[model samples]
Target: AECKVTVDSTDQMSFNTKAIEIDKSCKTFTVELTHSGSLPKNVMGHNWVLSSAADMPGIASDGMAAGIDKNYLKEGDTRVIAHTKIIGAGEKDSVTFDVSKLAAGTDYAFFCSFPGHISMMKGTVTVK
Candidate 1:
């Protein structure tokens, strides 16, 4: 029922959620990411990256090559629909995108582009 949501990541390299639902009436949706851990960005950074479910692997791989300076995401990657900047312990970041870019019933992927964090930091996004 809300147009925005907050996601929390920890030192465990995991998100507190597994899914995000956007209300159909929303023209845009926003995601606020917070790092609830106690580690530094270089060691336990997390960024919110959104893309098609199928693009997850490729984006992650490309992000790895891009490294931490680029928020672990490839520069100007068209496949990325939305993303928050990487944050460290006690820090926060946010991203917003038009809901019109998404299709109802289709599942998009949301994950942390930090190196190997994607293994457990990924989730699904959907429109309600």
Candidate 2:
């Protein structure tokens, strides 16, 4: 089924899944992020952002300047393939993007853009 994938995020700044795979047959792919903690957005928020592995640091750096209102992502960032809205405890957000945007055999990554969270909140995403 070409529906969605739900990943749980906690106050400790962690994602439940270490890796994600997108089937080639899926025309559009969705990522649903749920915060299963008690902290507020400013204190412990999480967002799911996707980009090529090589672009992670640049995106992360620029995202920090964009702030929470922009979901910690640079406005109209072409490098970003998909991203969910910033979410707080008990809140959830989802992002859907065309699977064709991704190229096979390339390294891709998904991570939380929260300040200082990227260190531990990153993983690989593959399209097959």
Candidate 3:
């Protein structure tokens, strides 16, 4: 990867980009997530979840029970590639993962795991 990528979530429940690509360079990659809303994370909390496209539904399904403090993700769950803490208006979070864990040209999906948000906040990650 050309190094790092950035994506922000809006209070309107959305991600600005539908797709992102990572170059096959660097030993690692970083994802910077920002909350562009004016609501508290508890009310309209936003967090990032990355995993194989096929793993999304199940991972997100379980996130609900994981709670807000857990960032809406299962604890110690290895199925996740990377994620950021739940954020709200004026807040931000970031997660970095080893590039070696992901294969180039594979289909990875990224989204906000907050309940109900999955339907609208999803995007694809195409590593190249």
Candidate 4:
């Protein structure tokens, strides 16, 4: 499937979109993340991490513990449905995942797990 979307993150710690709707017919989905700020990866960097809305807390907590080298995500973390690599200012990253892995009626979460980023850099995802 060619389903794709772009989300921009900034140094202010925010996502351009607050909600994402996925088409049910899509076999695969792609999300491209862009960093619009000028901070280094260790500073105001960002990444797109997808998971169940309910699993976000634990995933983020563990991700914070994982540090930036692992892209602020737990190694071998099964809760992560898909994710893009951490990117700094003017940088970009993307990820594609099977649409079938997403469950209808179950709202998902897309967030940046960079320590305190989740509080302001998260959003909801739903299947259309």
Q: Compared with the true structure, what per-residue lDDT tens digits does model 4 show for residues 1-110?
A: 34899999998889999999889889888999998877888889899999999899999999999988899999999999999988999999889889899876676999
Residue 36 of candidate 3: its Cα lDDT?
Answer: 83
- Across residues 1-128, which tens digit of lDDT does each residue of candidate 3 receive? 37798898998999888998877675788889887868988888988888999889989999988999898999988889888888898988888888788875567999899888988999888767
Write down the TM-score of every candidate.
0.96, 0.95, 0.94, 0.95
Any idea how many clashes model 3 has?
1
Q: Which stretches of candidate 2 lie over 4 Å from their true place?
A: none
Model 4: how far residue 23 lies from native, Å: 0.7
RMSD of 1: 1.2
Q: List residue ranges in candidate 1 displaced over 4 A.
A: none
Q: Which pairs of residues have clashing backbones in candidate 2?
A: none
Tens-digit lDDT track for model 2 on 1-128?
A: 35579999998889999999999889998898899989999899899999999999999999988998998999999999889888999899888899898886789999998899999999999887
Q: How many clashes in each candidate? A: 0, 0, 1, 0
- Residue range 9-98, candidate 1, lDDT tens digits: 999989999999889899988899999868999999999999889888999999999987899999999999989888999999988899
Candidate 3 residue pairs that clash: 1-25
Best by lDDT: 2
